[PDB]
Amino acid sequence: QYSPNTQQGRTSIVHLFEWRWVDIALECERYLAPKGFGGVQVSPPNENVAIYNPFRPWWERYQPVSYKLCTRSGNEDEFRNMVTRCNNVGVRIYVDAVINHMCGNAVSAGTSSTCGSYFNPGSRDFPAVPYSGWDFNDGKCKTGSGDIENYNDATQVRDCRLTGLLDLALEKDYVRSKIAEYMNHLIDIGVAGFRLDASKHMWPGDIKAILDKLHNLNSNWFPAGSKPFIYQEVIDLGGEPIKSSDYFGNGRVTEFKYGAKLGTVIRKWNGEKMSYLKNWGEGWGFVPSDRALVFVDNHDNQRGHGAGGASILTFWDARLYKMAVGFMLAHPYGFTRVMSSYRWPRQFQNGNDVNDWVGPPNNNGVIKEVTINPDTTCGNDWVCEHRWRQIRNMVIFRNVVDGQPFTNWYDNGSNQVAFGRGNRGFIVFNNDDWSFSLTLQTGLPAGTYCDVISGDKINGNCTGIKIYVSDDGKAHFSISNSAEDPFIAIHAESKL
Numbered sequence: 001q002y003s004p005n006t007q008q009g010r011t012s013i014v015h016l017f018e019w020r021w022v023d024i025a026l027e028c029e030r031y032l033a034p035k036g037f038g039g040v041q042v043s044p045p046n047e048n049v050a051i052y053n054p055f056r057p058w059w060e061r062y063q064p065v066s067y068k069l070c071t072r073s074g075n076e077d078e079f080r081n082m083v084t085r086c087n088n089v090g091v092r093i094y095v096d097a098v099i100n101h102m103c104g105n106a107v108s109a110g111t112s113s114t115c116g117s118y119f120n121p122g123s124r125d126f127p128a129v130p131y132s133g134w135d136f137n138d139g140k141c142k143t144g145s146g147d148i149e150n151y152n153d154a155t156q157v158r159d160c161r162l163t164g165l166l167d168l169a170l171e172k173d174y175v176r177s178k179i180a181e182y183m184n185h186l187i188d189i190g191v192a193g194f195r196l197d198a199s200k201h202m203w204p205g206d207i208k209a210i211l212d213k214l215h216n217l218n219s220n221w222f223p224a225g226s227k228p229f230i231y232q233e234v235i236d237l238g239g240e241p242i243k244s245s246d247y248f249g250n251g252r253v254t255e256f257k258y259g260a261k262l263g264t265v266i267r268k269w270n271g272e273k274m275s276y277l278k279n280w281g282e283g284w285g286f287v288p289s290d291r292a293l294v295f296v297d298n299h300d301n302q303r304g305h306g307a308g309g310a311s312i313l314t315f316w317d318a319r320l321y322k323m324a325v326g327f328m329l330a331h332p333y334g335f336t337r338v339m340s341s342y343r344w345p346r347q348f349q350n351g352n353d354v355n356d357w358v359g360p361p362n363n364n365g366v367i368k369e370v371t372i373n374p375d376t377t378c379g380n381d382w383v384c385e386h387r388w389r390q391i392r393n394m395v396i397f398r399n400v401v402d403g404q405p406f407t408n409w410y411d412n413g414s415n416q417v418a419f420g421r422g423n424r425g426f427i428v429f430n431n432d433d434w435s436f437s438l439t440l441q442t443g444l445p446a447g448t449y450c451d452v453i454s455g456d457k458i459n460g461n462c463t464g465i466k467i468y469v470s471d472d473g474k475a476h477f478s479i480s481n482s483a484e485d486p487f488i489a490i491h492a493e494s495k496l
């Protein structure tokens with residue numbers, strides 16, 4: 001469960017948040033595959049409640065009605081077409097599996113779902129699965145509200161309702177089997193792994209029982225004996241009885257301390273400095289690298305949901321965000337996930353965004369197609385951070401230096417740092433309020449290298465900054481604090 005099952009040489013996955021299947025399918029062929037991306041995390045592919053108040057929020061997708069592959073992203077035929085086309089070009093698909101619960105207990109009964117399936121939350125009736133009252137934790141939860149009231153009680157966190165979401169009785173073989181039937185359908189279609197949504201709200205033993213029922217990956221694309229890649233969403237910032245370590249036996253875990261701390265350092269809050277990043281990783285109290293799924297921001301915290309707070313860096317903070325993402329994919333710690341978002345009318349009032357619910361770009365509820373501009377950026381309000389030169393090039397940087405040790409660290413005691421990855425890559429950062437101009441040891445072979453942040457290597461030439469490395473591995477770096485991107489990165493493949 002710990003291996004990504006990505007094609008050899010590809011080291012990152014991208015979250016194409018709310019993208020339609022047909023859009024992901026062609027993105028796999030026209031961009032992801034040739035640019036060296038390892039895989040894609042897709043939004044929940046199962047039928048969900050259609051919420052009209054507020055109008056079709058992104059979060060309606062986290063309220064299951066059935067396990068039919070029928071959503072605003074497309075139907076089953078379109079899903080399978082996507083998985084097939086992506087796998088054919090070496091790009092894997094990872095499903096966001098919402099298995100801890102069904103929809104909100106307060107949702108009106110009827111057929112207000114993405115595929116017309118009937119459901120009755122009040123009576124716990126979900127005939128499309130089918131689930132009944134005997135399949136929920138109503139009689140198991142011990143809180144007065146029936147919802148999770150205190151995270152200091154590990155039992156209610158698992159047996160009660162997360163914000164009113166009907167909690168599935170995961171100890172029952174029937175329920176474990178229905179979830180496995182769903183996941184096995186996806187595995188046989190060709191999916192490579194899953195993001196286990198709300199894993200903190202499930203007992204590690206129940207998750208394990210479910211995973212024991214899973215099929216080995218489809219033998220038409222994967223080697224025999226391949227296991228689905230499993231990463232569990234467990235928000236562990238340290239002050240609770242539940243630890244992410246409790247889930248290591250099932251697969252990898254999301255390390256939310258990563259983006260939270262990276263944001264604080266980059267923003268220079270509480271007197272933190274980039275120079276402190278010398279021992280970044282386990283030294284900061286993070287989970288072991290081989291059990292970590294890292295990222296700067298996710299679909300939740302980029303908009304005030306989940307955990308991380310105001311420190312979280314997002315596309316809205318473009319300049320600093322690129323540096324954060326840059327540092328992340330240059331550093332050897334964990335398996336990296338890049339975020340790809342859509343723009344929404346963010347409206348702050350008293351410090352909170354009142355439009356944090358806004359769903360993906362749409363026309364009367366129908367998700368807009370992802371259009372590509374001549375400069376390779378996206379239209380229709382899709383941000384496409386994965387297409388930004390600075391991010392895309394760093395995704396490649398990670399592929400190029402994979403396996404190389406962390407070496408040749410430099411710091412000025414403040415916010416100007418640098419380090420290399422073996423003899424295959426080097427990166428320099430300037431986050432201070434003054435210019436950086438110094439000759440550093442890179443560990444790279446002598447020659448002329450193209451800075452992949454300010455430009456690209458094209459037709460035997462660089463379109464941006466050029467770095468000259470001497471026989472002894474030294475090279476001069478000059479970064480003004482006024483630069484568009486205050487960081488430079490060079491690697492074995494950007495060499496002239």
Ligand SMILES: C[C@H]1O[C@H](O[C@H]2[C@H](O)[C@@H](O)[C@@H](O)O[C@@H]2CO)[C@H](O)[C@@H](O)[C@@H]1N[C@H]1C=C(CO)[C@@H](O[C@H]2O[C@H](CO)[C@@H](O[C@H]3O[C@H](CO)[C@@H](O)[C@H](O)[C@H]3O)[C@H](O)[C@H]2O)[C@H](O)[C@H]1O
Binds near residue numbers: 060098104165305306
């Ligand atoms: C959001 C975060 O809360 C905890 O995270 C806790 C954390 O564990 C704790 O330590 C501390 O930091 O507070 C955090 C926030 O409560 C969990 O532990 C963590 O697993 C979870 N994150 C995952 C799962 C949920 C549920 O499927 C999804 O919710 C997402 O979908 C839900 C269903 O539509 C949304 O509720 C929505 O529907 C409910 C129906 O009853 C309404 O009551 C609610 O007001 C409405 O917002 C929710 O706002 C949204 O974020 C989310 O997108 C996904 O990423």
Ligand SMILES: *[C@@H]1O[C@H](CO)[C@@H](O)[C@H](O)[C@H]1NC(C)=O
Binds near residue numbers: 459460461
């Ligand atoms: C490389 O760039 C220079 C200009 O900087 C140009 O003279 C040369 O023709 C370019 N080389 C190729 C192969 O295009």
Ligand SMILES: [Ca+2]
Binds near residue numbers: 100160
């Ligand atoms: Ca639960």
Ligand SMILES: [Cl-]
Binds near residue numbers: 195233254298
């Ligand atoms: Cl996540």
